[PDB]
Amino acid sequence: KSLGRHLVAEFYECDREVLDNVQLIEQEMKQAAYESGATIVTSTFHRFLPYGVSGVVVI
Amino acid sequence: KSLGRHLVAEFYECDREVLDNVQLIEQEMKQAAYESGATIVTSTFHRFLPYGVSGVVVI
Amino acid sequence: XHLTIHTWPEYGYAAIDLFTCGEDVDPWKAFEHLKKALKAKRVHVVEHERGRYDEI
Amino acid sequence: XHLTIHTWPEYGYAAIDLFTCGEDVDPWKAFEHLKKALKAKRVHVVEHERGRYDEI
């Protein structure tokens, strides 16, 4: 149907200790990639200051 | 009235040589970041075979 | 392709993108894991078709 | 946040995402430079409000 499927999601009321954990988020994000059955090319996560996490996983 | 602004874009009938040039795409994506004012956190680009380029600039 | 995430701890909010390719890659399997992982209590998801065949 | 591109030379197609944050950052400038640089003859763009104040 299309070259790809794209989910744009807003997550509200999340565990704030989870949201502000750069290492955990990467972990989780990496695992999420695994569940979808995709192959990870690279991943780069960054801990914004003060509170905040930003990361991407290329598949 | 929102933390961010996100454009989901479909580009069609592009110059096919450019689309397959990993160093130029990176060059152009980084420029677009400049034009926008965005403060570049990190940038990573990949050349897939036989064709295709995936790249992301974390801002 | 990519899976991205940008979190705002102060608001308990996370903007997530799950863009995959190939029939063997289900983006909703990524969503489900993340929902569990974040303890998200309210979500809103819009599914986009990237590069429709009838468009390219 | 982030700015992404995934190209399909064989189709002259590129999936672009310009996700910005802050009133001084305009994703549309990024769009203008890329439409030019890539010489797209046709484009379709959806603009999402990520993290709406009333939502959060």
CATH code of C37's domain: 3.30.160.750
Has D48 been annotated as catalytic?
no
Could you give the number of structural domains in chain C?
Answer: 1
Q: Closest by alpha carbon to A29, among C7, B9, B22?
A: C7
Min distance D10 CA to chain C CA atoms (Å)? 10
User: End-to-end CA distance of chain D, in Å?
Assistant: 17
Q: What is the resolution of this structure in A?
A: 2.1
Task: Give chain C's count of helices (H) and strands (E).
Answer: 1, 3
Relative orientation angle of helices C27-38 and A22-36, to the nearest 10 degrees: 150
- Chain C residues touching D13 at Cβ < 8 A: 51, 56
On whether the CB atoms of residues A9 and C35 are closer than 8 A, the answer is: no
Residues facing residue D3 across a β-bridge: B57, D18
Placement of tokens 């399997």 in the chain: C29
Structure solved via = X-ray
Residue B48: how many other CB atoms lie within 10 Å: 13
Q: Closest by alpha carbon to C6, among A39, D3, B18?
A: D3
Residue of chain B with shortest Cα separation from D30: B32
Please tell me chain A's helix, strand, coil percentages from 3-state DSSP, rounded to the nearest 5.
30, 40, 30
Distance, C-alpha B25 to centroid of its chain: 6
What is the arrangement of strands in the sheet containing B53-58, beginning at the earlier edge strand? B42-47, B53-58, D3-8, D13-21, B2-12, D42-52
Residues 6+ apart with CB under 8 A from A13: C12, C39, C40, C41, C42
**Domain range holding D54?**
2-56
Q: Report CA dihedral (B27, B30, B36, B37) to the nearest 10 degrees.
A: -130
Distance, C-alpha C38 to centroid of its chain: 13
H runs (alpha helix) in A1-59: 16-19, 22-36
- Chain B residues touching C4 at Cβ < 8 A: 56
3-state secondary structure of C55: coil
On whether the CB atoms of residues B4 and A52 are closer than 8 A, the answer is: no
Question: What Rg, from alpha-carbon coordinates, does chain C have?
Answer: 13
Secondary element (H or E) of residue B16: helix B16-19
Residue contact D2–A56, C-beta within 8 A: yes
On whether the CB atoms of residues C16 and C5 are closer than 8 A, the answer is: yes
Residue D42: how many other CB atoms lie within 10 Å: 11
Residues 6+ apart with CB under 8 A from B35: D29, D30, D32, D33
On whether the CB atoms of residues A42 and A58 are closer than 8 A, the answer is: yes
Placement of tokens 């990573």 in the chain: B44
Residue contact C8–B3, C-beta within 8 A: yes
Gap between the Cα atoms of B44 and D22, Å rounded: 23
Gap between the Cα atoms of D2 and D20, Å rounded: 6
Domains contained in chain A, CATH given: 1-59 (3.30.360.110)
Min distance C18 CA to chain D CA atoms (Å)? 12
3-state secondary structure of A28: helix
